[PDB]
Write a protein that binds this ligand. Structure first.
Ligand code: HEM
Ligand code: HEM
Lengths: 173, 173
């Protein structure tokens, strides 16, 4: 049922009066096209994050970056906490990062990229999942988990991470 | 269907050696407890935002605030774009904002709160939906849509927004 709680000093105020005073001090956040940042976006509680891509740029130089493509969700503060899981199809490495809103993320000056990775992990595996280990590894500048996963795939072609890009392109054609 | 793409200059590079060079230039974003902000969080593309609460503070005075409770989803860049929909149950008003991560949002010095609003809209209604008009209204310092909705609820009690909080509380007991 509809209910109202209030500090007792507002007992004799009308609802209209109160909301007029609240709005007066609040002002206008100007949540409009071209004007939305973290200062006026507001925020959500209780939710997870999802998307066909996750991307991040270096804080050391703000240029070096990677883009993970697939079907990913991140539990954020839901349990198991701070777990990335789902399907990791692709990984692009290079300099500069554009898009991410009404267009996909893209590396501006691409070096190298991998497609058809076919890596997946369940929510319940938590931080032990391969997708989480790979992507979080890369956020921390640690390629070890990625290289272990790539060695697993490349094993089918008699290759490894010590193979060159030309060798890998030759066997996977 | 594993594949690779690369700038021709990396043809004779080993995968291992490329990733070594990428990682040593990327560094470590330091995505750890207490050290995560927007500068080192990364981002997702193609996704939606949801939660049991939405909340926001004034950009002018950094204090006046509200918290909307219920079951909410915001389409973000998915169509119909920038639409808040679902069920709106509660709305609390006052000064200060606490929590939002591992605890619910809460107003620090509450003035007034409304429960059992029982308002709901669909994604397909877009910006015409009542949950969107109410909350976007409040974000714009514009209580008009809220007051229309409250007059609807209150007319079944023979009251309106010009009634006092004591009178509303008496009728809704
Ligand atoms: C949940 C309550 C929210 C509502 C009702 C809402 C509604 C809107 C509306 C109606 C617009 C554009 C229409 C205009 O120009 O008048 C807009 C823009 C935008 N909002 Fe929201 N929004 C909400 C929360 C958020 C959140 C949590 C974010 C996350 C960062 C966000 C990000 C954006 C962005 C990036 C834009 C447009 C930027 C641009 O196109 O230049 N909004 N919002
Ligand atoms: C998508 C890939 C991501 C992965 C794999 C990831 C992983 C992690 C991990 C493992 C932790 C805990 C590490 C520790 O205990 O030191 C953490 C903390 C955190 N992450 Fe993420 N994260 C990702 C993206 C994001 C995003 C998009 C946000 C949203 C802004 C975010 C916000 C946070 C916050 C606020 C904390 C810690 C806050 C605290 O307890 O002090 N992360 N993340």
């Amino acid at each position: 049922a509809f209910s109202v709680n209030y500090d007792s000093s507002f007992g004799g105020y009308s609802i209209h009066d109160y909301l007029g005073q609240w709005a007066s001090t609040f002002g206008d956040v100007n949540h409009t096209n071209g004007n939305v940042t973290d200062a006026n976006s507001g925020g959500f509680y209780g939710g997870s994050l999802s998307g066909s891509q996750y991307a991040i740029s270096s804080t050391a130089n703000q240029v070096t970056a990677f883009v993970a493509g697939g079907n990913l969700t991140y539990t954020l503060f839901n349990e198991p906490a701070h777990t990335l899981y789902g399907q990791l199809d692709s990984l692009s490495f290079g300099d500069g990062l554009s898009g991410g809103d009404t267009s996909p993320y893209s590396i501006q000056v691409p070096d190298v990229s991998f497609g058809g990775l076919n890596l997946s992990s369940l929510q319940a595996q938590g931080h032990d999942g391969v997708v989480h280990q790979v992507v979080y590894g890369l956020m921390s500048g640690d390629t070890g988990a990625l290289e272990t996963a790539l060695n697993g795939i490349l094993d089918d072609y008699g290759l490894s991470v010590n193979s060159t890009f030309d060798q890998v392109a030759a066997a996977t054609a």
